[PDB]
Amino acid sequence: ECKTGNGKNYRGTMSKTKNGITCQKWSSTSPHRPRFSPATHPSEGLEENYCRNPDNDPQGPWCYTTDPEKRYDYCDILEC
Numbered sequence: 004e005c006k007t008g009n010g011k012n013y014r015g016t017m018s019k020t021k022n023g024i025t026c027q028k029w030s031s032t033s034p035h036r037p038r039f040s041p042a043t044h045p046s047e048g049l050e051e052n053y054c055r056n057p058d059n060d061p062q063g064p065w066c067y068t069t070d071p072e073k074r075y076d077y078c079d080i081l082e083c
């Protein structure tokens with residue numbers, strides 16, 4: 004678990020955002036409804052509640068949040 008680039012191929016194990024709030028399972032639909040999931044983007048690594056980049060976001064790995072008022076947010080992934 005290290006990152007390189009926008010973290011596109013990142014198949015790491017981090018499950019909390021940069022502010023230490025824990026990620027929402029990408030399969031789950033609360034508190035937020037994900038626009039990306041394992042059923043639609045099977046090649047994207049949407050397993051558990053880990054930090055991915057299904058959309059080649061320039062800011063790197065993010066995940067759906069568990070704080071009902073925070074939709075998504077980035078992950079502090081060690082630099083590779």
Ligand SMILES: [Cl-]
Nearest residue numbers: 034035036037
């Ligand atoms: Cl939502």
Ligand SMILES: [Cl-]
Nearest residue numbers: 038039058075
């Ligand atoms: Cl999105």
